[PDB]
Amino acid sequence: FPTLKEWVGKRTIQQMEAHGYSIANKTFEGTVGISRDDFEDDNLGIYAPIF
């Protein structure tokens, strides 16, 4: 609101404002692929932690 000021004649009508701001969201992706044979015959256990 505008600051109060000394009153002399008649009231002077004043104005305010308003603001706006928008954020648009985005899509993100990551993909890896491994052969089925290589995954299945994995006795060591090195490809387990991919998930």
């Binding site: 060591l44 090195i46 490809y47 932690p49 991919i50």
Partner: protein
């Protein structure tokens, strides 16, 4: 006074074992910076997976 030879006078000593361990070795402090792993065969192989 009996004038004994030098070798006889040199044999008149007592053996003391207060000096037995010599000078002790430095403290062992390698566990603070090293990880101990036991091997069972010709060599060890380590493997990890990237991110």
């Amino acid at each position: 006074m009996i004038v004994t030879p030098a070798s006889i006078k040199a044999l008149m000593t007592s053996w003391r074992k207060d000096f037995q361990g010599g000078l002790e070795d430095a403290p062992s402090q390698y566990n603070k910076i090293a990880m101990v792993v036991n091997s069972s065969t010709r060599s060890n192989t380590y493997g990890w997976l990237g991110k």
